[model samples]
Structures are given as C-alpha cells and as structure tokens.
Target: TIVKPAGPPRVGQPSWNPQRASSMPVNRYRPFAEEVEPIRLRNRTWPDRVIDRAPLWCAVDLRDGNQALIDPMSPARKRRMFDLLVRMGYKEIEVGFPSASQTDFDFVREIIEQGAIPDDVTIQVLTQCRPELIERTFQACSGAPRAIVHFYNSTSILQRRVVFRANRAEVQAIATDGARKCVEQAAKYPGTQWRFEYSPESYTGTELEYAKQVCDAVGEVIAPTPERPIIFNLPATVEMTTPNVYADSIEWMSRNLANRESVILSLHPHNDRGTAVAAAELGFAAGADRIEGCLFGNGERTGNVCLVTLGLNLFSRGVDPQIDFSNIDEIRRTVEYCNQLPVHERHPYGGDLVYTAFSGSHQDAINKGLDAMKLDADAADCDVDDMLWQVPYLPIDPRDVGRTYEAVIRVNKGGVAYIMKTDHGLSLPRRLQIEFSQVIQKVSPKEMWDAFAEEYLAPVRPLERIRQHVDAADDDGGTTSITATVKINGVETEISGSGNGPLAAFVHALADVGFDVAVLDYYEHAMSAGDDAQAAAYVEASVTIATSKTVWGVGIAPSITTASLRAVVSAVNRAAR
Candidate 1:
C-alpha cells in the first residue's frame, strides 16, 4: 500500500508507475557526460556483522532446480551453469541430488578434477537417508577441498501416516544413522575439510517435536566447530504457512533445540504458495544463516526459492545475499538458452516486463518517478528503484538488478485504458500525462510500438511516425521554439521561433484551426546515422475533450524535440477539427 520514495526528491513526491515490457523507457543520455568509476565499497547500510562476513548466495539449480525442469539441463549444460555459479562467488553450493543420477556424480568429480572448486568454496551433494545413496554422495565428496555431505528424510506425521509408514522414533533413527555415516566418512579424509548438513524433509508440515528430533539427532551425534559448521536446512517441502510462522519455527529451532555455536542453521523452502521467498527471508531475519535455492527460482514443483530474486530483493533493501548479478541480462539469456526455459514476462527483477507498468497513470508516474530516484543523494546503487509494486504496481527498478534506463526505451505502447508515446522529455508535466493517457488507451504498447518501428526504424520503411519534444513552459502555450530544423510533410520547416521549442512552432504551422495543447508525451532519437544522422523526434500531447477525457496528437521530426512537441500539439488541437 505504500509506494515510498528512496528519499524525497528536490522536485516532489515519487510517482507510481508499472511499465510493460514494450513500454519500458529508452536511454535518456547526457551529451558528453563522463562515466564514473565503479564503486568498490558496499553502499548498503546494513550491519556488516552478518554471519559469514556477508551474504551467501547458493544456486540450487544443479540439484533441486534441475529436478523440476521439464527437460533438465544436460550434464554439459549443468557444467556450464556450475561454472557460472562458481564465478558468482558461492562459497558453499549444494551441487546435486546424487541419488537421482550418475551424471550428478560425474559433474561433482569434474568440479574437483578440473580444480574448478575454489579452495574457499564447498561443494555439497544431497541424498536420501538411505545408506547406498549417502555412501555414493561421500564418494563424490572425497576429492574436494571443502565438502559437505548432506542427508535428508521425511519427518511429518502425514509422511508417517501415508507415505513412509514410520513412527517418530524411526524417523529419528534414519537421521541419526545418516549423520553417523557422514561423520565417519568425513573423519577419513582430514586433508579434505568435511562438514555435515541435514534437511528434515517436509519440515514445515512435520510435527514440531519430530522436527526437533532430527535437530536433536544432530546435536547429539554430529559435532561441528565454528570452522566446520553442521548445517540444518529446514525445508518447507510443501509450503503451509505465512513467512512469520516460518520465522517462528526457525526461532524455536535456534533458541531451544540446537547447539547454536556448533551448528549453522539454514532454510530450503519451496514455492508451494509462491511464498518460498518470504519464508526464506523471514527465516533469515529470524536466525537461519544459509539459503539454498535455484537461480530464477528454477526447481522441483514451481521451482526452488528464486536465488536471483531473493538476493536482489535483499540487495535493494540494503542487504547483500553475497552475489553479484549486475550482468542480469547475460544471466537471463544463458539460463533461458541452456535450460530452454524462457524467463516469464512478469517474473520479478529479471522478467522482461517486471518493472513495466501497463496503465497510463502508471507510465506517467514511473517516467517522472525514475527521474526523481536518480536525483536522491541518499539512494544506493540498489535503491535506484525498489522492486515492490505498490506504485502503479511496480516494486523494483530494473536498474537495481543491473539494468539501465534502456528499460524506458520505446515505451509508447498504449492499452485499452493505457497510453502510447510516454517518452516525454524534461519539459512535460503530470497534467499532460493524465490527458495523454486518455487518448492512447485505445491501443496497446504493441500496436503503437509497432507503429513507431514500422514508421521509424525499418530498413526500408516510411517515416510517417515522428517523435517530438515539447517545451511546455510556464511561459504560456502561445509560443513554439525550434532547437533544430528539419522537413515536415514534403515541406522543409528549417525554421526557428521564439516559442518554448520548435515542436509548437511546427504544430501551429500545421493547424487548420489549432487548439491549445499541453506537452503530454514525447520521444526523440538519433536516426541511427552514427554521429552524422539527423535526430528523429516523436511527440504526443493532448487537449481536454471532456471534463474527464482527452484526445492525443502524434508527430515525428528529425529534430527529435521539435517532432515530439508537434505530436503533443497535434493531439491537443484535434478537438478544434
């Protein structure tokens, strides 16, 4: 409900906006601006004392995420994705669900043999409580410098009642036996540092006492030093409650049952309710130290908790999940290609349309809101746009995930109640935004956007659609000034005027009987002629058609600002016709 600003802008309150993919803003570049040096220090203000000195991002795509794919990654692809994971700085990664495939074993061995496993990084291999699988998992662990032999089994009463047919005591035995085996195998190779981890499968639905039993088994059998922590991953195998309850569960586990200093607590929540992220967040806020999830939330079921989203969500809000996803587009392309899974149009952070708002009211707010966010001195790199959608339903800025203002490029696709031509320049205002929204809503981002493309960017197309810029000054709407000159409608209007800009000058020239127009929306671009081509302009402006509605006018010009202003004036003057 709150669409708060990162910090108050010098201008005013931050506006709400939800941009559509096709409606994202384009690059609004500064002429000859020098690039700043890359930041070396953390800009976030969170406490630096978080457990591992920083956030730990583990991509579970290799094991858990892969299990859910329609067509899982081939071993080669898995190897490549694995390479990406290491390059991303995941010190502890759950590499595979070993019992499920031999390829898992092979991939793990390759990581070791190729020395892809960094000295500080740990490779974790998951398995059921069954001895054979756990033994094979240990075999994969032997060659690695830092390895975690993870074991798991079900503990929920329904698991006993309908699935495993085992009593609570039997569940504890499976856990203890597995822990004992992991402890013994770890003991054999002193040169290779080993640790233990256990997941109380279906921990969220399990009887609290039984979940405790698994924790208790570890507390009794597997002793871990601070250097080598025994991790407890309480997975909501199938989600059943709110984030706070998961937090409370973790709080209870951290407070009463486990040996705190000796064990590292963790979470492995699934998205049964699309709340695994919430569960993980609350669990971490409550005390869980490690998170295991797939990139983009790819896993079994709806997929594992999305590491990219979760990490960035934390990052934007002043916490680092200890990973850099600054090259987000590359990440998306590689994952989409290798996994053959397209990133959804509306998936948060990485979605093609996540930050895009379709509503006209939204584009108006967002266009200006983004302008304001960049001006705030208190804003961090991540705070460029928070990813929560309270504003016209957008929560995060694409730039926060390492995207740029190019998202705002070509944003002029209108909707049934939306508007096209949203790239209004510095001189446009909010009233014009509302007025412009009315006329463009007859179409969509696609229809209007295609018009922009077919008319403007086509290799062999007509320049019928022109984008313009309007200098709608507090200086009455009576004047139009031209910053540059170009031809219009078979006539060369290389003319300059004393108006706000040249857009209104040309608009007045075109008027059979022009009406007063406000600068509703505008767009301008260099006609791709390198440094020598003319700048193309597109503009949309509106005039009141009724107390509650308005009509739009569009214009295109090589003089971008002038062309766009013409469009705005054209829409506003339509009523006179």
Candidate 2:
C-alpha cells in the first residue's frame, strides 16, 4: 500500500544533473548579525548565573495559540482550555484579545458574569494602542475580581521602516499613549484589582537604546510602585539572534530601565530559530521575573517557548516548577482536543515516546541502572520511590510523569534479547543472545516469539532423537558412552559411541550418522523454582560437512541432560538444512 522511491537519480533522468551544485538562492538571505546590530555587554553575568527558582509563569494559549490556529477555537473549546489552565495552577492566564473579535468579547463577559474565575487567579486581556479598543478591552473585564491589561505596539527597525513608516518618537508615543489609556480604563473598573503589562513587540529586532527609551516612557506614564509594579514584557516577537545575544539584550535593559524595582521584567520568546527554550533560560539568568508562553509552545510560526519543557527542566534540577504536570498525558490530550493539533511524538517530557529506549546498549544500561537502584534502596532500607533517581539515559523517572516502565525498553535490531526476556520469560546468555539476534536480523520478523520458536524450538527433521541412554565406563577413566535411537531422514537407526561426556558422546553418535557436530559451549538453567519446573538448555556449536558454520540452539525438558542432548540435535538439524 505504501510506495517507495523508484531509485536515486540516474543518468538520463530529468533530475540527474552532475554539473549542478544547487538551485537555491542562498545569497539572498542576510545573516542575523548583518541585519540586526549586536549588543556588547562588557560584564555579562548571565553566562555564569544559574536558575535556582521558578519564575512567575503566564499562559497565553487562549490569545496567542488560538490566533495561530487555522480554525480558531470556538467558545466551548476556549472555556475548556481556560478551565484546564486554571486546574493546572496557572494563576495568570491571558484569556483573549477581547477588543479584536466579538467572540472573544462575549467569552470574557461570560466568565466574568458567571463568576467562573477563581479568587486566587487573575485573567489577562490584550489590546492595541488605540483608545477605543482599550476601552472595549476593559468593558469585557468589568466584573472580574482581578485582571491585567496587556498592551503592545511594534517598535522594530524593520517594522518602523517598512510597515509603519514612522520614526522613533512616533513609536514611543504610541506606547506611552497606550499606557495612559490602560490606566484610565482601570479607573473606570474600580471594583476589580487592576494590573498593567506593556510589551515592546518585536523587541529583539529593535535597537537596544530605543527599546529601553520606549519602555521607560511607558513606565513614567503608568507610574509603577514596588508593590504594584508594571510588567514590561520584551517579546522576541520574531527571533533574530542566538540565545546569548538575547540574554545580553535582557541584561542591558535590566541595568538601564528606569525605576527597576517598579517593573516586573517578562519574556515572550517565539521558537523561530528552535532556540526559544534556551533563550528563555538565559533570559531568566539575565534577570527576567516572568515568562509568557503556551502550554506546549502552541502559538504563531514555530510557536512560543514550551512552558512544559521549561517547568520540567526545573523539576529535573530538583526545583519545584510551581505548576502541576504529574499527569502530563492528560494535559496533552486536552490541549490536542482544544487546539485540534497533535503534539509531536518526540515532544519533550509530554510525548508518548520520550521515555522509551530502543537501542541495545542504552536499554542494557537502563536495565542495569534500574536493578542497581532497587538493590541500593533495599540495602538502605528505604523505599525506591524515596531514593535519588540515578537511572542511565533517563533524566526524570517515568513514574514522576505518570508513565509506566512497560514501554521503556522496546525492540530494535540489537534489542532482541530484552524483548525475549520481557515477552517470552527467557533470560538468554550473552553469546546466545548475539547468535539469536543475527537470526532475527535475517528473518526480519514482525512477531518475535513466533520467529524465536520457529528458529530453535520447532520439531527437528532428519535428526529426531527417539530414545537415548548414557553409561559411565567400568574403568575409572571417566569415559561415558551413549546408545540412541534416532529418526534420520525419517528412517529409524540405532547408534552408539563413546566420549568424555554424555553430550560429547551424543556428538560422536551424530557424526557417525553423517552429521559432524562439535559443541563449543553449553549452558542450562531451571525455568522455574518448583520440582515441576522445566530446564532450558542452550548450545553453541559448529557443524562441518565441507564448510563449517556455527549456530545456537535451545531445548526445554524436565531432565537437564535430555535438554542438552536435544539442543545438540536441534543444532545438527539446522546445519543439515
């Protein structure tokens, strides 16, 4: 049903151009540094600093994530997402951009009038610099217990030159005027506890000095105090540089912003370059107080930085993330339903397969590490759950995220032994595992247990043992002899031979029947503990007619010696085939 490529490009094909290097206009693109001037921080301390605590988190899923969707969420879906955010301990949630759409305005009023918001939580609404929209945004939050009026205007050099066609003073006035209007709107809704947040949108592409000046002008209009500090969010609306450069910009602004104690610095990073998480981390080290993002980085373009990853990163480092993600799969399911988008299977911390290991070496190490943890915990007389996690290849315990260990180790080309142990209850020896793994590679079987049974445990043809007896020699020389009845090529034949042991004697008897077999190694173990338990035997042997080849065989029986003899016959039958 699935079609693969016909073949690689060959001579005479339309795509086969040996002289062409490439067809892309790579030269048209400018490097980030060439487009945006880099900042120089002589005493940059963010590189040496560490994040020892969680920052204030703001969930902007309803506004940013909803706006990015192809079919934006309806009122019912928005309510589901809002309720999920509240249940997950998100105190500050950006509900919507009420001023832009009637749907958003009605949803805001629905929550406020119905008293759906919690007393401990505050809803945030975004509006533009326009006075009418600012007023409309306030009307939506009229009866809410607490709300934040978030406003922004673009100040990037590119936007100023191409989109707005305005200079520095005009952009600063837009921000200042928005700040004044937000303050006035809050005065009209005196029943609610009002907070204000301002963003220099596209802050990463704006000049550092001009961005600082604009933020300071807004700060002066709002007149923030320490107890009620205005949030100055510098958004990487479009990421333009490396994470370190963004950190440098944040640290520079932190030093230069007026009334530093009266401003709660915030970061809203987009994953344009796939480094939004790293940028947010360094931004924190450079002194950010809060982060604005979607649940799994679901927003415009590459989406916002993933709050799930950021939070779990803190949890892995032994710090409380302040948010709840213990049942991450449940949260992921809710987000997928509301957004109509599936989270990637490889998404960090929340994906279905993030905790799984399919590599042979990795699975082996993880298996041993888990065993050692249990042993160490037992010796310490403590619960394994209470012990420090030190499992190899797993940064956080799967159980911590509400996942089980059943899916942790799965089958790949070299991971066949683990599959056998888990699925078939067979603990194979190392050499036997190597031999069986090659057979698995050749067969490329979809069902491992069936393939294993066919390879080693099936009825042997042309070498079936009907009956066998072994006797120690009369002389004290330790010589043993075997007499056996076998069905060779479907004809019954009686054979006898003498050797150093029962297995060696059986090998001689097999050779007498035109099958030359030599035992290289033999191992046997009880499959269970009781007297009724079966013994499993494994044999590594080489067979010779003209060319010699080695193979592994397995046999299970009540008698250990019988199992070993069956194992030799199994190998000889394979060689004959």
TM-score per prediction, in order, is 0.61, 0.70
lDDT digits (tens) for residues 503-570 of candidate 1 = 54644533422233455456555545555545444344444332222444444455555455445544
lDDT of 2 by residue, 1-577 (tens): 5444444454565754534434446788787766777698989999999899999999999999999998899999999999999998999999999999899999999999888899999999999999999999989898898899999999998999999999899989999999999888888877988899999999998998998899999999999999999999989999877899999999998989999999999999999899999999999999999999998899998999999999999999999999999999899999998899999998999887787665767767877888899899989998888889999989999889876443232344336666666665577877666555545444222566776787788865777898998896777768999999999878999999889888889888878778888778888888778877788888888887536777777888898888888888878766655
lDDT values, one for every candidate: 0.63, 0.86
Tell how far residue 123 is off in model 2, in angstroms. 0.5
Model 2 CA deviation exceeding 4 Å by range: 1-24, 406-577
